[PDB]
Design a binder for this molecule. Structure first.
Ligand SMILES: CCCCCCCCCCCC[N+](C)(C)[O-]
Ligand SMILES: CCCCCCCCCCCC[N+](C)(C)[O-]
Ligand SMILES: CCCCCCCCCCCC[N+](C)(C)[O-]
Ligand SMILES: CCCCCCCCCCCC[N+](C)(C)[O-]
Lengths: 598, 600
């Protein structure tokens, strides 16, 4: 299986089950029909030059003005009809297949998509919409072009080349056979080596093009700054030099194409010259008819027509195979966090949260949690705070099982979250993160996202609960207002309110505020804090906060130092202890005063 | 006037022709001539080579005058092969010789448009998304290049060949044959075109669906965390699958239609083939035509219809290329709102005063903002401009840099109306630190050096020091070669403002503008940067446009705008004493800060 040379062959064999699904009968029928269309089309194209030979033969055999007229007429008509017919077969093959190709590549994409969702968070799925989109577009085009070239250019040509070898064998040579085989070998090898050089030139040209283009775009998007420094002439010169570098590279790449074409023309035409000369010489001895010259000429031109594209085909087939290989590598990549076999669902009857001696870090060379233990009582409002090395920023990620502890365990109710299904676990958890994100869709879609079947009544109830309902009411399209971009832009407080609403639709027993107000301004922070307190009403709530004043009303506060629980208690008890929390409090207070000073 | 014509493809091409035939470069003109010669040689060769084929056949079937027939046939066969290779050689030599011409012409068109875009008014608001613009321009470049190549090296050679084939078929056959092939070409073109319009529409629908599917997938992947938080994986998968199926259906239709065009083309071509070959053989029956003639006619027809095998795509591309090119010329045509007057003198700043003289202005003609604004800023003085929401102060810097002209009134620097001087000299007199400074996609050292064209490493260092950003750059791994902006290291607002101060330091302008310079900063950052700003304001005329009055209270004088006019003028104390608009504002701002101080 995967235990193989890892070449184009393996990638292709891996793709083969998509083309021959074994789920779908209809597609299998289509593949068969397409193959029949290939065989018919080749049969037709091989046959039609014989029709040409006969017409010539009848006019040359050949004592004057004879029934040769009827026969020659019949044969030219057969030849023309054959030409049209082969085209009909080829286009019919394309048509019958296209559904197969489209389905197979779709299923491959869907499999990759699903896996990418199963894979680890640590794969840094935070990047540019444009860059990713360009890459995926490029690869999609790559794999498609590749499939079409492989199935409908290379394979028919292998069949035709073999048939021409058998035919040329039976009726000529075998000097003819060796000459054409050597010609094909030289043609392929030459095309290949020149193509490798050409692909390198293409890459350089492409990179230069990107550079000139980046210069123009950066310049234009910075029109104000360019005016401010009166730098138009400068930017023009800057663009122009880049544009010149690009043009030089383009001239080189395009010229190298002329070289490949000429090289190919020489090979084909030496073969033409030799084959036709030899055919004439055979005719001179009465061994071969005059029709034979036409026969050989047609056979060779037909053979070498698909190889006219060979260079491009090769580059393309190469690139696609690379890209597919890449696809499969992702499908192959192992999943860091998995449900154990036959994992039970989490059942939350009492929503306590326990951290039991948790040792964790993102990377094995940097340990963040050094044996963290704490208990959060069901229904309590708790805060987790600490200074810079405390490790509090891991809590949410550990709790939703984005990662597993190196050592120790996390429990909800009485249960190790490592031993339950990931879906049931996340089903018990609500989060309002620091930067909530909106999908590119309506406010309603975004709120409804909290639970799969969510009704509009539910969206309304949640929107009320987060107090974003009036704002939505004052939009013309209300809940059908598109947001994100290109959509309406929301303020930070508005987005946090959507996030809270989303969680309200989910309606979880355990709710996490993960630096929820950290990006908000003061007035916004104070406003959203009452909504948060209200929404915390009959849930176990864990608030992870930088600014202590925002969490002072907590039932209890857990203070972390150096990956362990340093202090615990209510805000007054902690101030009374004169410990780490008290110090932080003083410090934050002092800074608040300082800003007020100025 | 060439611009005085119907707006079609012909006009667009005629506009492009001077780029192809420069009358500046000459070398390129030679290349164009040479390329045309390669077209002619290549055509002569391809038209000639079937005759060599015809003759070879003739020597084999009427070997009476052509002997030794083996020798005659061989010589002709070799002639034919040599001819094939030769036509290919001419064609590629033509491409090679032209390619520099093409690249240069399109480069110049691009440079003309670029220069224009910089000349056009700010109101076209040229700040938008990099990815979209880049993909569009890439699309347009590919589009125009492809149409040029198809026009010069597919359509035109085919016209030459088609005419030649008509003259030849005329002299030596038919002329029923001439009519038949011409009818065939006409049917072929018409069928191809009508099918192509339909196909192009299907292509557009397909493409739009593809983008939609890709966007759903990308939104999901970039939102892996949120998708996780809500257990929404299956939902997102189904959501991708639905779009993906819509795309696949559209693609299937589009590719199927390709099969229809190909089949229609083959029907037309092959009917012609059948008729021509029948007519030729029957002509042979009557002793009119040689058997070589059959081969000759067949070869001629296949050669004629090979470049037309691409006709559909070709048609789609050339059309699009022409549209895109027209768009280019439209930009070049668009008139310039703000221009130097003819033979404009340089602005000469000896004493750097600034005068606003009865200035009436608005961005748009139905909304007037400045209603006759007048003020004098003394050379070397430090002044602030403040006002409430409708005062119009946000226009001042834009008027000074002549992004726009006053509707009425004028602006003077050192007694010279800025409308009548060269824009470059005027802008040379002015420094600005704007509210949001922007960085080029390049190193931080480049961004600082940008203040003056020839800026030395030393000047950059001095400016960085004056901006108090030198220490920060030192602690960068790559120092001045640290890449910044998008695709680069992210700088804080204060860091960006400090880079802007450094650029202005490199520039060393006589007059300096702080245009809401600290308005995007937090309080401490603002307080830090203000001392730097004051130091750099030392011996310049400085104009500070500020929302927050406390940040400008130490000004030599303060200009208070209300409703597009000068309401109040004077020192911060004179203004508090008057108990006027500035006083009210001051009081209110103080109140607000205290209220904010309250929440702690
Ligand atoms: C309809 C075609 C769907 C198949 C999936 C296409 C995704 C292409 C991504 C290829 C990128 C691989 N890589 C990283 C080497 O570029
Ligand atoms: C939105 C209007 C587009 C006009 C922009 C033209 C600026 C010149 C950039 C052309 C780039 C040429 N290229 C891609 C070959 O480098
Ligand atoms: C071959 C290089 C010539 C400059 C390339 C400029 C690209 C032009 C893109 C124009 C597209 C505008 N549009 C879609 C409205 O037609
Ligand atoms: C690291 C990049 C690999 C990501 C591949 C994701 C494949 C998602 C499917 C996108 C296919 C777009 N399509 C086929 C509709 O054009």
């Amino acid at each position: 299986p995967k235990d193989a040379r890892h070449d184009g062959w393996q990638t292709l064999k891996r793709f083969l089950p998509y083309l021959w699904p074994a789920d779908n009968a209809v597609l299998r029928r289509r593949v068969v029909g397409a193959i029949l269309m290939v065989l018919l089309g080749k049969a037709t194209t091989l046959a039609l030059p014989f029709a040409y030979k006969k017409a010539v033969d009848a006019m040359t055999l050949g004592g004057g003005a004879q029934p040769a007229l009827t026969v020659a007429l019949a044969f030219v008509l057969a030849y023309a009809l054959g030409r049209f017919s082969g085209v009909l077969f080829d286009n019919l093959r394309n048509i019958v297949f296209e559904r197969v190709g489209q389905d197979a590549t779709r299923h491959l994409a869907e499999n990759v998509f699903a896996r990418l969702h199963k894979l680890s968070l640590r794969f840094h799925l935070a990047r540019r919409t444009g860059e990713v989109t360009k890459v995926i577009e490029r690869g999609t085009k790559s794999i498609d072009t590749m499939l079409y070239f492989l199935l409908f250019n290379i394979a028919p040509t292998v069949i035709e080349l073999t048939a021409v070898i058998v035919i040329f064998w039976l009726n000529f040579g075998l000097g003819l056979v060796t000459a054409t085989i050597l010609a094909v070998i030289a043609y392929v090898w030459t095309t290949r080596t020149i193509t490798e050089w050409r692909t390198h030139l293409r890459e350089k040209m492409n990179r230069l093009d990107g550079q000139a283009l980046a210069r123009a775009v950066d310049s234009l998007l910075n029109y104000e700054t360019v005016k401010y420094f009166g730098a138009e002439s400068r930017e023009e010169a800057r663009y122009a030099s880049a544009a010149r570098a690009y043009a030089d590279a383009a001239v080189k790449s395009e010229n190298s194409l002329g070289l490949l074409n000429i090289a190919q023309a020489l090979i084909v035409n030496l073969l033409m010259a030799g084959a036709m000369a030899w055919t004439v010489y055979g005719w001179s001895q009465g061994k071969l008819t005059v029709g034979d010259l036409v026969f050989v000429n047609t056979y060779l031109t037909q053979l070498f027509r698909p190889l006219d594209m060979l260079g491009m085909v090769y580059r393309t087939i190469r690139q696609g195979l690379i890209d597919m290989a890449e696809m499969f590598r992702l499908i192959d990549t192992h999943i860091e966090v998995a449900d154990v076999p036959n994992a039970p669902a989490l059942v939350v009857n009492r929503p306590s949260v326990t951290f039991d001696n948790v040792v964790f870090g993102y990377d094995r060379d940097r340990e963040i949690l050094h044996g963290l233990s704490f208990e959060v009582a069901a229904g309590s409002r708790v805060a987790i705070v600490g200074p810079s090395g405390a490790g509090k920023s891991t809590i949410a990620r550990l709790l939703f099982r984005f990662y597993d502890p190196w050592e120790g365990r996390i429990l909800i109710d009485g249960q190790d979250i490592a031993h339950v299904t990931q879906t049931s676990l996340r089903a018990a958890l609500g989060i309002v993160p620091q930067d909530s994100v909106l999908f590119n869709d309506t406010i309603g879609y975004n709120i409804a996202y909290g639970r799969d079947g969510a009704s509009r009544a539910e969206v309304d109830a949640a929107a009320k609960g987060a107090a974003i309902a009036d704002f939505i009411a004052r939009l013309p399209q209300g809940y059908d207002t598109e947001v994100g971009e290109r959509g309406l832009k929301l303020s930070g407080g508005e987005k946090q309110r959507v996030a809270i609403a989303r969680t309200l639709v989910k309606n979880p027993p355990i709710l996490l505020f993960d630096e929820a107000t950290s990006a908000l301004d003061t007035r916004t922070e104070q406003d959203i804090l009452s909504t948060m307190r209200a929404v915390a009403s009959h849930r176990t709530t864990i608030s992870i906060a930088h600014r202590l004043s925002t969490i002072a009303d907590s039932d209890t506060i857990l203070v972390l130092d150096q990956g362990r629980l340093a202090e615990q208690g209510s805000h007054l008890d902690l101030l009374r202890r004169d410990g780490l929390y008290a110090e932080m409090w003083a410090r934050q207070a002092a800074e608040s005063a300082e800003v007020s000073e100025a």
